[PDB]
Amino acid sequence: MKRLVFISKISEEIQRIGKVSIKNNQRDNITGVLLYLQGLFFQILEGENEKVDKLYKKILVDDRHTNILCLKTEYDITDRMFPNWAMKTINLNENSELMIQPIKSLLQTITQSHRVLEKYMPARVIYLINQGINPLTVEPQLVEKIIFFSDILAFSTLTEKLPVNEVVILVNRYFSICTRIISAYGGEVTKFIGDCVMASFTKEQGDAAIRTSLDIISELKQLRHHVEATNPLHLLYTGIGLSYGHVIEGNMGSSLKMDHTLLGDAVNVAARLEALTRQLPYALAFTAGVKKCCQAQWTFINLGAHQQEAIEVYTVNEAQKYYDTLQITQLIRQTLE
Amino acid sequence: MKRLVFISKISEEIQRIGKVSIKNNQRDNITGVLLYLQGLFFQILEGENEKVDKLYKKILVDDRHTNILCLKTEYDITDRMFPNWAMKTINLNENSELMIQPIKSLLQTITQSHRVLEKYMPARVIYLINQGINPLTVEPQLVEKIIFFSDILAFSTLTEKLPVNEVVILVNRYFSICTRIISAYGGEVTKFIGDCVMASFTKEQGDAAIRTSLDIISELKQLRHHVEATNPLHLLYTGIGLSYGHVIEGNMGSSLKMDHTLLGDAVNVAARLEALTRQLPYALAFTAGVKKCCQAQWTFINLGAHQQEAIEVYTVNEAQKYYDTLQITQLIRQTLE
Ligand SMILES: Cc1cc2nc3c(=O)[nH]c(=O)nc-3n(C[C@H](O)[C@H](O)[C@H](O)COP(=O)(O)O)c2cc1C
Ligand SMILES: Cc1cc2nc3c(=O)[nH]c(=O)nc-3n(C[C@H](O)[C@H](O)[C@H](O)COP(=O)(O)O)c2cc1C
């Protein structure tokens, strides 16, 4: 058998949910409980492994709730936790009694706090937590990654002139755009380094990594002529480095502070290729290793060898600029005065 | 009045706790509940602001529990949540009844999950959460920081030779040492960047920032002759850059991913000074701005001007090396073969 636990955010209607679960959970011989408290669901489900999983994939796509996080998975259990409840619904709001109110209030406060912490988490950890894996004890492994690096053109002159709030508005907008597109193509964001976005793709995701690069460049171009001139967003440009190689993926740090990152020379290479694009007529630079993972009929352009042994640099025709890097940089400064 | 909520980890004895709280919580006219479940405390406390705070400082130093996190603070409440319980203790393990078991199990699972997420958190966020501040809505502010940067000497040759697990053992040991010392002197760690540790100190913490730098250098020296030669730890060296200036402190990112970092040119400067020490006869390099925040009678040594306008670089005599940077680097490589 098998048992999992998840939480989710909602979007008499819950009564239609439990009427169903009961019938289907006997049809497939399942038990568990559904709690509702302050617009959040909590569910425990237990039963034969194939039957419990056929159900939770159905649950994942139910549009009655969002931001689903599976906290816990127990494999090959032997004793059910609620053998007599096909699916028991406990509306924790209807309960007004004294002795459940403390536990009611704490469940609310921990889970809400929890939901806030989730947004500062490494995507990989949240993924591990969903798959039942313990992030703190997982063993760091050597994996093959495409490494992605993007940051803001002449950002230090954007921070130089704008007031703090426009800086933040601008950085957050940049980060929204980057992560939405990376995540849509199947990449994972590793972390933010100042103005920089570090991500990874798999070795079957070369095309998706170039497409990600071009799309970001594209949305920033549209964004610049969508807004008025006096909007700092009018001044937002990026350059993107891709590398490929082996990296160590895992957790690092002491008891008092943990991080779940990627170590390996390819990390440095993508960052240097990213910075290389400030001297290139292209916004995207990548290695030959990235090119090998690319199946699509890209028009690859060779930018020669660069720097402790030199490496070959490539780009695609679609990453060409219609601007000069020191032109944009003096233009940014002239605008802000 | 005022009300807070915290959780902590434990180290009939709980019976001695509640017997006390009751008497003192009436003495100072306080109410709330204490839950115990699977080696974790949960407490809600409410009352007049001066009285509730005199108590929680006492609680913080009680050695019966550790890893105390205050989740929630409510200011100037008007209605108490438990007006009749000076301090009601609910041992959630003693309860075996059916209808509390689901809520019992969920409270356990969320809070445990919670505890795991806390270890991937920005120190500043955990601090904000403790002080009652909402991290997601706090407004990013411009602050004066000493910026700290440390990373591992010729790390790319350590990753080149050692197997993955020795890399991780070695990085984790480095990070334990760095964060323990930074945190002891009063700094905060911002994040980890690969082999790099980024931290900040206040402008009244110059001496503490140099002391932090020297102590780390010191512990790594001791560590190298404490271990056998064949231990990768025998090969672990660091360089440290300090800068000073204005940075933006706050949260950045989209709904789907949030980070709580420091933006500003001083971040880049400390990183470049850090890298500068690979060509210097010292392991610590800092700006004149850092020197100004230093009150202690340091023997400051001037390393000239470096690089887009050049800045003056300083170090202290105590940061001198007894090694050559390219000697250690070829020595590391020779060892590993
Ligand atoms: C929070 C939540 C929990 C649910 N739990 C169950 C459950 O335990 N068992 C179940 O059969 N359906 C559950 N559902 C509803 C599923 O969508 C359901 O399996 C589906 O409507 C079945 O459709 P079908 O019989 O046509 O295949 C749940 C829905 C929600 C929102
Ligand atoms: C989890 C926990 C909760 C506590 N809650 C209270 C409380 O609510 N009120 C209280 O007076 N003491 C509480 N204490 C114990 C304090 O240490 C206590 O105030 C102290 O022993 C008083 O000493 P004094 O009367 O000599 O000043 C708590 C201790 C623990 C571990």
Q: Is A247 exposed, middle or buried (0-12, 13-18, 19+ CB in 10 A)?
A: buried
Interface of B with A in 63-92 (CB under 8 A): 71-72, 81-82, 88, 90, 92
Query: Among partner residues B5, B88, B125, which is closest to A109 by beta-carbon distance?
Result: B5
Helix and strand tally (H, E) in chain B? 10, 13
Q: Round to whole Å and give the CA distance between B332 and A288.
A: 29
Q: Is B180 exposed, middle or buried (0-12, 13-18, 19+ CB in 10 A)?
A: middle
Do B219 and B181 touch, CB atoms closer than 8 A? Answer: yes
Distance (angstroms) between ligand 2 centre and the Cα of B46 equals: 14
The number of beta carbons lying within 10 Å of the beta carbon of residue A83 is 9
Nearest ligand, CA of residue B66? 2
Residues in B closer than 8 angstroms to A107, CB to CB, are 103, 106-107, 110
Do B313 and B188 touch, CB atoms closer than 8 A? Answer: no
Q: Is the CB of B17 under 6 A from ligand 2?
A: yes
Q: Round to whole Å and give the CA distance between A87 and A25.
A: 7
Distance (angstroms) between ligand 2 centre and the Cα of B40 equals: 16
Q: Is the CB of A55 under 6 A from ligand 1?
A: yes
Contact with chain A for residue B157, Cβ under 8 A: no
Q: Round to whole Å and give the CA distance between A20 and A22.
A: 5
Q: Round to whole Å and give the CA distance between B178 and B171.
A: 11
**B106 Cβ partners below 8 Å, 6+ apart?**
A5, A35, A42, A44, A107
Residues in B closer than 8 angstroms to A254, CB to CB, are 172, 175-176, 179-180
Q: Is the CB of B44 under 6 A from ligand 2?
A: no
SS3 content of chain A, % helix, strand, coil (to 5): 45, 30, 25
Q: Which one of A33, A71, A120 makes the best mutation probe of the B interface by having the most chain B beta carbons within 10 Å?
A: A120
Q: Is B244 exposed, middle or buried (0-12, 13-18, 19+ CB in 10 A)?
A: buried
CA-angle at A236, arms to A232 and A240, nearest 5°: 160
The number of beta carbons lying within 10 Å of the beta carbon of residue A322 is 6
What chain A residue is nearest to B198 in terms of C-alpha separation?
A193
Q: Round to whole Å and give the CA distance between B66 and B119.
A: 15
Query: Among partner residues A122, A256, A258, which is closest to B183 by beta-carbon distance?
Result: A256
CA-angle at A272, arms to A240 and A182, nearest 5°: 30
Q: Is the CB of A36 under 6 A from ligand 1?
A: no
Q: What single-letter amino acid sits at A273?
A: L
Of B303, B266, B262, the residue nearest B282 (C-alpha): B303
Q: Which one of A94, A117, A136 makes the best mutation probe of the B interface by having the most chain B beta carbons within 10 Å?
A: A117
Residue-wise DSSP of A239-274: EEEEEEEEEEEEEEEETTEEEEEEESHHHHHHHHHH
Q: Round to whole Å and give the CA distance between B237 and B216.
A: 10
Q: Is the CB of B21 under 6 A from ligand 2?
A: yes
CB contact under 8 A, A125 and B120: yes
Torsion of CA A253, A259, A264, A267, to 10 degrees: -140
CB contact under 8 A, A120 and B122: yes
Q: Round to whole Å and give the CA distance between B162 and B337.
A: 10
To test the pocket of ligand 1, the residue of A15, A21, A36 to mutate (highest count of ligand atoms within 8 Å of its CB) is A21
Q: Which H or E run includes B275?
A: helix B265-276
CB contact under 8 A, B259 and A168: no
Q: Round to whole Å and give the CA distance between B59 and B63.
A: 9
Nearest ligand, CA of residue B63? 2
For the CA of A64, the nearest atom of ligand 1:
31
Residues in A closer than 8 angstroms to B191, CB to CB, are 191, 259
Distance (angstroms) between ligand 1 centre and the Cα of A183 equals: 27
The number of beta carbons lying within 10 Å of the beta carbon of residue B165 is 14
CB contact under 8 A, B106 and A193: no
Interface of B with A in 266-285 (CB under 8 A): 267-268
Alpha-carbon distances, residue B106 vs A68, B100, B111, B113 (angstroms): 15, 10, 8, 10
Q: Round to whole Å and give the CA distance between A221 and B262.
A: 27
Q: Is the CB of A168 under 6 A from ligand 1?
A: no
**A307 Cβ partners below 8 Å, 6+ apart?**
none
Sheet holding B2-10, edge to edge: B65-75, B2-10, B40-47, B30-37, B88-91
Do A5 and A55 touch, CB atoms closer than 8 A? Answer: no
Contact with chain B for residue A131, Cβ under 8 A: no
3-state secondary structure B14-63: HHHHHHHHHHHHHHCCEEEEEEEECCEEEEEEEECHHHHHHHHHHHHHCC
CB contact under 8 A, A120 and B118: no
Q: Round to whole Å and give the CA distance between B178 and A253.
A: 10
Q: Round to whole Å and give the CA distance between A153 and A162.
A: 15
CA B193 to chain A, closest CA, distance in angstroms equals: 8
**B217 Cβ partners below 8 Å, 6+ apart?**
B238, B240, B283, B284, B319
Q: Where are the domains of chain A?
A: 1-138, 139-337
Residue position matching structure tokens 């800092």:
B286
The method of structure determination was X-ray
Residue position matching structure tokens 């930074």:
B182
Q: Is the CB of B58 under 6 A from ligand 2?
A: yes
Nearest ligand, CA of residue B46? 2
Of B159, B200, B197, the residue nearest B178 (C-alpha): B197
Please tell me what DSSP assigns to residue A1: -
